[PDB]
Design an enzyme around this catalytic site. Structure first.
Site, PDB file in Angstrom:
ATOM      1  N   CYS A 215       0.884  -1.143   0.000  1.00 31.83           N
ATOM      2  CA  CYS A 215       0.000   0.000   0.000  1.00 31.83           C
ATOM      3  C   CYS A 215       0.938   1.212   0.000  1.00 31.83           C
ATOM      4  CB  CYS A 215      -0.980  -0.067   1.175  1.00 31.83           C
ATOM      5  SG  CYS A 215      -0.293  -0.661   2.765  1.00 31.83           S
ATOM      6  N   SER A 222      -2.043  -3.488   3.604  1.00 37.32           N
ATOM      7  CA  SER A 222      -1.303  -4.709   3.275  1.00 37.32           C
ATOM      8  C   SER A 222      -1.435  -5.764   4.382  1.00 37.32           C
ATOM      9  CB  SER A 222       0.184  -4.415   3.025  1.00 37.32           C
ATOM     10  OG  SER A 222       0.359  -3.563   1.893  1.00 37.32           O
ATOM     11  N   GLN A 262      -3.392  -1.061  10.936  1.00 38.03           N
ATOM     12  CA  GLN A 262      -3.092   0.266  11.471  1.00 38.03           C
ATOM     13  C   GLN A 262      -4.194   0.883  12.325  1.00 38.03           C
ATOM     14  OE1 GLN A 262      -0.442   2.921  11.207  1.00 38.03           O
ATOM     15  NE2 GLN A 262       0.358   0.886  11.732  1.00 38.03           N
TER      16      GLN A 262
END
Ligand SMILES: [Mg+2]
Length: 298
Positions: A215, A222, A262
């Protein structure tokens, strides 16, 4: 674990943030000495996203073997992935060198070149057949052979040639164009439709080198992609959804690259994707067609 029971419990109590922060707290910490060498400063897109030394991909060149890329080797699942940042204008040659040397058949791109008004990735592949790219530093040629454009992703056939030997290889490029930075796919269906398109191509199979997934930083989107894929494969081995502990799988992946997944919502999405994907694993082949319809790919 069992994942669906756990999902409902976390949801009910609204504790996704806490669960996710716990993962961050427990995650591996390993040195990234090579990534941090002064000579490599311009090879890193983000100051705080670096490959661990122990799992970094080494380029096969004496000058400088560094690329911001990590080998995620999932021993139990028996699948490997290379996760890397979106190439920089000076690392596109390195990127294709890595693809060549690692014998990858597929590249999975989960970002757009421009996101949130900023450039997140170099234009590292050719957009027009008649305008091929030559990477002079690594001596590679890259040609667009064809593309299949769907509503939210595009699949390209590329020809990568080692100009030193004149050997050529077909590389498949799977470009998901509607997955926002620090966001989630529109639905489990759209995500799974895409994942299974990658699977069906042969790009993830053991006869090839590890698929390259990226990414912008190669950790958030990812990580989500790889976590879902690995969990589904683990389930497939034993036909035992209950044996899959998603958080433990993520922690295992994080031994190989920092920061995978994330946000708490990306973690929550991963559960949704794996829980829905389990239907196919457990023998409902028809659900694949349902995903395709619901994805409105065209
Ligand atoms: Mg044209």
């Amino acid at each position: 674990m069992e994942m669906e029971k756990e999902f409902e419990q976390i949801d009910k109590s609204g504790s996704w943030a806490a669960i996710y922060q716990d993962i961050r707290h427990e995650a591996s910490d390993f040195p990234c000495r090579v990534a941090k060498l002064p000579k490599n400063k311009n090879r890193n897109r983000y100051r705080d996203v670096s490959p661990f030394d122990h799992s970094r991909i080494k380029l096969h060149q004496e000058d400088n073997d560094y690329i911001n890329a990590s080998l995620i080797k999932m021993e139990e699942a028996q699948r490997s992935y290379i996760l890397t940042q979106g190439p920089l204008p000076n690392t596109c040659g390195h990127f294709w060198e890595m693809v060549w040397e690692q014998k990858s058949r597929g590249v999975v791109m989960l970002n757009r070149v421009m996101e949130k008004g900023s450039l997140k990735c170099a234009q590292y592949w050719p957009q027009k057949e008649e305008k091929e790219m030559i990477f002079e530093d690594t001596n590679l040629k890259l040609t667009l052979i064809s593309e299949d454009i769907k509503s939210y992703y595009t699949v390209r056939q590329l020809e990568l040639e080692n100009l030193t030997t004149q050997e050529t290889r077909e590389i498949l490029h799977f470009h998901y164009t509607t997955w926002p930075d620090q966001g989630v796919p529109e639905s489990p269906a759209s995500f799974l439709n895409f994942l299974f398109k990658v699977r069906e191509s042969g790009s993830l199979s053991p006869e090839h080198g590890p698929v390259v997934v990226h990414c912008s930083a190669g950790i958030g989107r990812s990580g989500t992609f790889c976590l879902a894929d690995t969990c589904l494969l683990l389930m497939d081995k034993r036909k035992d959804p209950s044996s899959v502990d998603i958080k433990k799988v993520l922690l295992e992946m994080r031994k190989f690259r920092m920061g995978l997944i994330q946000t708490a919502d990306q973690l929550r999405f991963s559960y949704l994707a794996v829980i829905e994907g389990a239907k196919f694993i457990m023998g409902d082949s028809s659900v694949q067609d349902q995903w395709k319809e619901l994805s409105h790919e065209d």
